[PDB]
Paper text:
SIPs contain stably attached flavins and use NADH and/or NADPH as reducing agents. Here, we present the functional characterization and structure determination of a novel SIP from S. bicestrii (SbSIP) and show that it is an NAD(P)H–siderophore oxidoreductase.
The structure of SbSIP was determined at 1.9 Å resolution. The structure revealed two domains as previously described for other SIPs: a N-terminal or NAD(P)H binding domain and a C-terminal or FAD binding domain. The FAD isoalloxazine ring shows a planar conformation and is stabilized through aromatic stacking interactions with Tyr-60 and Tyr-225, and hydrogen bonds with residues Thr-61 (backbone O and N), Tyr-59 (side chain OH), Val-75 (backbone N), and Asp-73 (backbone O). The negatively charged phosphate groups of FAD are also stabilized through hydrogen bonds with Thr-60 (backbone N), Glu-232 (backbone N), His-77 (side chain Nε2), Gly-81 (backbone N), Ser-84 (Side chain OH), and Ala-83 (backbone N). The triad of basic amino acid residues (Lys-45, Lys-236, and Lys-239 reported in SIP from S. putrefaciens, SpSIP) and proposed to form the Fe(III)–siderophore binding pocket is well conserved (Lys-44, Lys-236, and Lys-239 in SbSIP). As previously observed for SpSIP, Lys-44 forms a ridge with Lys-236, making the access to the FAD cofactor smaller when compared to SfSIP. However, the pocket of SbSIP is substantially smaller when compared to SfSIP. However, the access pocket to the FAD cofactor is smaller than in the case of SfSIP and likely sets the preference for NADH via steric clash with the 2′ phosphate group of NADPH.
Author numbering:
A (entry chain B): 6 to 248
B (entry chain A): 4 to 246
Write the structure that this text describes.
Amino acid sequence: PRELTVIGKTQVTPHMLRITLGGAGFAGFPADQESAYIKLLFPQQGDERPLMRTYTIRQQRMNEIDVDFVLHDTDGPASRWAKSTEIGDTIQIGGPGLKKLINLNAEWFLLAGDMTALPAISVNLTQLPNNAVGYAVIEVLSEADIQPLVHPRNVQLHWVINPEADPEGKPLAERIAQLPKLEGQGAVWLACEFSSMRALRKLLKQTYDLPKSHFYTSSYWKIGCNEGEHKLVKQQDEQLENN
Amino acid sequence: PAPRELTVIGKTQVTPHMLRITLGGAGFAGFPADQESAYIKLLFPQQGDERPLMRTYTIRQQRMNEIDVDFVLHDTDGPASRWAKSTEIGDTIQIGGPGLKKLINLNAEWFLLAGDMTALPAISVNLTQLPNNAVGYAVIEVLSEADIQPLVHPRNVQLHWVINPEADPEGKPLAERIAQLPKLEGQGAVWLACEFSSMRALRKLLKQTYDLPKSHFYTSSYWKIGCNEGEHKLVKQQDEQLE
Ligand SMILES: Cc1cc2nc3c(=O)[nH]c(=O)nc-3n(C[C@H](O)[C@H](O)[C@H](O)COP(=O)(O)OP(=O)(O)OC[C@H]3O[C@@H](n4cnc5c(N)ncnc54)[C@H](O)[C@@H]3O)c2cc1C
Ligand SMILES: Cc1cc2nc3c(=O)[nH]c(=O)nc-3n(C[C@H](O)[C@H](O)[C@H](O)COP(=O)(O)OP(=O)(O)OC[C@H]3O[C@@H](n4cnc5c(N)ncnc54)[C@H](O)[C@@H]3O)c2cc1C
């Protein structure tokens, strides 16, 4: 696995901390992997297997990537590492995985997620055509966490300010259910906390009934679960769904 | 009662002359629940020692941590309509309220709602509170056919749209439409709000047609031609006393 060096830190917003990774270990990293996922490896005391955490490549340059960390409640190893790490420190990473961008063969676009998906949504918005139409709906912890995102003028940005994730999964789904319905062939991309993902998925299956080719949904974390516990819930739900 | 500072977190052009602004954030904490169709006051600060100007708007929709307010993009901009067009996500505004909501009386066999675009938000909310088997009319005066909206409503509450590009100082359009509707049989409830002169014409008509108790007969002037809201408040208070 690759060893990258911390060469910068940027407080993007109060709860979003961006780490730049590069150095000699970056050599050979595949080009143009923005929005692809990587795995951060955290060594464990007394265990040869690392703990692993999934993050998005927010930006990529010739010899560097940026990774954006939500400074979430209830630190885990990854959010602790992001706050504590110092320039010059190194971290092993695996990946990148396959990019899962929104389908561009569509007349309108609906993107939604919470702050764990804001990096990927940011990248997707830069890949939409300039004449694109639709919505990007993002749940953030505070108004200060709103970002000035690049986006097509007619893809309307909507921010939902929710200081604590809702186990009932309402805030994003309630906002989107109360937006006008989009007409034409659409593409949907959403990722957020597990319960909000299910609520959005249910709502959007009912509103638009889109094929899987144009309907990406993913749970990125779950309240009360560290990432290992989350992967199980997620696989069970994606199977129960697909079946 | 110190005003709440809310952040603009979304904008949606509902129709060409109806612009919906979503407001929320930390200033929303504690906001009373279930206040759709209640009024709020927007504050526009003035130069120097001057107290701010205040404008009255309706809570169109309410969610966990935000409200939507629908602005008519009316002829002859005032501070509120100019503000709605120019404001950007991230901007803030102070609000007062909510006031007491005045929903149509539900103890009735039929329902008649009427108003112009300043009343379309409250009428929309009222239509969602009626029982599904409700019978009657909702008659709305809009500036153009494009300002007609696909409102949720009981199937047997019939929507009627009056298309009038400029308000009538004699107050004829809504009244002439409603005077020619079949008369409803049974115990009724009426709710109407529009430009002052049309309000007077409708109140007179429906007092004569149905002569309902005040418990079941709501009328309100929401604005007046040639008057800013301060000038309007005086006329409205004088007319409410005469009654
Ligand atoms: C494909 C993919 C891409 C992702 N990209 C990013 C990214 O770019 N940036 C990012 O910040 N996250 C991203 N995530 C989410 C990230 O993997 C999880 O948030 C992970 O749980 C964080 O690891 P951790 O060590 O801090 O917490 P863990 O040890 O996994 O969990 C500790 C505790 O924190 C809670 N918790 C975890 N995440 C959050 C959160 N966001 N809000 C509130 N509580 C939380 C857990 O429920 C648990 O209680 C991505 C997830 C996936 C599946
Ligand atoms: C209880 C209540 C609820 C209301 N809810 C809403 C609401 O949800 N949405 C909404 O748009 N309005 C609503 N109104 C009406 C709103 O208060 C007035 O339209 C207000 O005058 C607009 O403020 P302004 O600063 O733009 O104009 P002002 O500075 O008050 O007036 C400027 C000029 O514009 C004219 N004008 C004002 N409104 C209109 C109009 N609708 N059409 C044409 N000319 C107009 C005035 O006559 C004046 O010449 C409500 C009124 C009341 C009493």
